[PDB]
């Protein structure tokens, strides 16, 4: 049955709640972003209204075959009215099409659901600046102080410099990047741009990327693996057996693979700067795990909440153990005492 933290009090709304069948008293189902833990349960047979971004709606139509008449895309940064309640969709700095949702309840309560997000100071100048928030449904994925990671920009610098150096030393090397859902596209697109190549991939993944509006995408991506020296593969195939096999498939066009696995976090971060990261190597295959996160670090999350000053925080991640829940609640108290709200 539907958890309380997916239900918006005083409305008929739910958020990311499609795996529970027909939710009692739900008149409209919101979807924050196109990741499988959030959309689990949508299909061509769904006949309730779905509210989402333009990008997420392109993905619903094209990949899951949801019928057009049930998809209700909304523009960002725009006040809209849904079943008589004012709503606003805000950029979540997660994956393409990911949003936060602001709900303005008929009684005066204002609710922010972050969906999945990576908090950033740019958010402190959207429609959030203009009013108070009573309840915050918060993406608490990395809500512990051990989770520090670099900026996205520093990580992309590291990847571009590493790939450019490797291919300049050996023009017969291949670069591979792992993927398992939309998000983290900058990794592979920035590498391709510096090498003057397109990114080669499966027709299924190419279709997925064409759903996203990204400007100049016919320019960066392709299904012709032959013409490409950056290849995208399923994350599961990013290991020595998987990559030896792929290399066999390229018919002696290449003699070396350099592969990247963008991960959320790895405990190497507790003891290492980005500048200091090294690969795992076996034969002519090297694998780099890079800390490219699309979720807030602990410090970024803390800053967001101390700026917003919500009256109540409802975590949406790590809620399944008493120890995790208690840990998070202790941090929320610290943050409030330290900021004076
Ligand atoms: Ni997500």
Swiss-Prot record:
Q: What GO cellular component term, any one, is given? A: fibrillar center
In its keyword annotation, does this UniProt entry include Nucleus?
A: yes
Q: What is the effect of changing residue 295 to A?
A: Impaired nuclear focus formation, reduced interaction with PIAS and increased sensitivity to cisplatin
What UniProt keywords apply to this chain's record, in alphabetical order? Cell cycle, Cell division, DNA damage, DNA repair, Hydrolase, Isopeptide bond, Metal-binding, Mitosis, Nucleus, Phosphoprotein, Ubl conjugation, Zinc, Zinc-finger
GO BP terms, alphabetized = cell division; double-strand break repair via nonhomologous end joining; interstrand cross-link repair
List locations, semicolon-separated. Nucleus
Top-level division of the source organism's lineage: Eukaryota
Q: What induces it?
A: During mitosis. The mRNA encoding this protein contains an internal ribosome entry site (IRES) in its 5'-UTR. This 5'-UTR generally suppresses translation while specifically promoting expression during mitosis, when cap-dependent translation may be impaired.
A Gene Ontology molecular function term for this protein is: zinc ion binding
Is Ubl conjugation set as a keyword in this record? yes
Q: In which tissues is it expressed?
A: Expressed in brain, heart, kidney, liver, pancreas, placenta and skeletal muscle.
State its role: May be required for DNA interstrand cross-link repair. Also required for checkpoint mediated cell cycle arrest in early prophase in response to mitotic spindle poisons. Possesses beta-lactamase activity, catalyzing the hydrolysis of penicillin G and nitrocefin. Exhibits no activity towards other beta-lactam antibiotic classes including cephalosporins (cefotaxime) and carbapenems (imipenem).
Family note? Belongs to the DNA repair metallo-beta-lactamase (DRMBL) family.
Q: How does it assemble?
A: Binds constitutively to TP53BP1. Binds CDC27, which is itself a component of the anaphase promoting complex (APC). Binds PIAS1.
Q: What is this protein called?
A: DNA cross-link repair 1A protein
Portion held of the full protein:
700 to 1040 of 1040
């Amino acid at each position: 049955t539907c958890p309380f933290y997916k239900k918006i009090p005083g409305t008929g709304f739910t958020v990311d709640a499609f795996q529970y069948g027909v939710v009692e008293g739900c008149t409209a189902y919101f979807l924050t972003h196109f990741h499988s833990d959030h959309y689990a349960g949508l299909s061509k047979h769904f006949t309730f209204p779905v509210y989402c971004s333009e990008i997420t709606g392109n993905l619903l139509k094209n990949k899951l075959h949801v019928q057009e008449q049930y998809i209700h895309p909304l523009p960002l940064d725009t006040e809209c009215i849904v079943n008589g309640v004012k709503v606003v969709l805000l950029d979540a700095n997660h994956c393409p099409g990911a949003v936060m949702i602001l709900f303005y309840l008929p009684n005066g309560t204002v609710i922010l659901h972050t969906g999945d997000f990576r908090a950033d100071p740019s958010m402190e100048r959207s429609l959030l600046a203009d009013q108070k928030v009573h309840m915050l449904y918060l993406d608490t994925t990395y809500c512990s102080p051990e989770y520090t990671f670099p900026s996205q920009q520093e990580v992309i610098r590291f990847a571009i410099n590493t790939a450019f150096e490797a291919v300049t030393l050996n023009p017969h090397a291949l670069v591979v990047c792992g993927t398992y859902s939309i998000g983290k596209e900058k990794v592979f697109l920035a590498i391709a741009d510096v090498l003057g190549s397109k990114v080669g991939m499966s027709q299924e993944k190419y279709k997925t990327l064409q759903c996203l509006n990204i400007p100049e995408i016919n320019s960066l991506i392709t299904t012709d693996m032959c013409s490409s020296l950056v290849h995208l593969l399923p994350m599961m195939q990013i290991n020595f057996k998987g990559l030896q096999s792929h290399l066999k498939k390229c018919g002696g066009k290449y003699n070396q693979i350099l592969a990247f696995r963008p991960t959320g976090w790895t405990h190497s971060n507790k003891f290492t700067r980005i500048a200091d990261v090294i690969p795992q190597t076996k034969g002519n295959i090297s694998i780099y795990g890079i800390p490219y996160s699309e979720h807030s670090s602990y410090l970024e999350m803390k800053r967001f909440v101390q700026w917003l000053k919500p009256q109540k925080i409802i975590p949406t991640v790590n809620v399944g153990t008493w120890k995790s829940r208690s840990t998070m609640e202790k941090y929320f108290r610290e943050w409030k005492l330290e900021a004076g709200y």
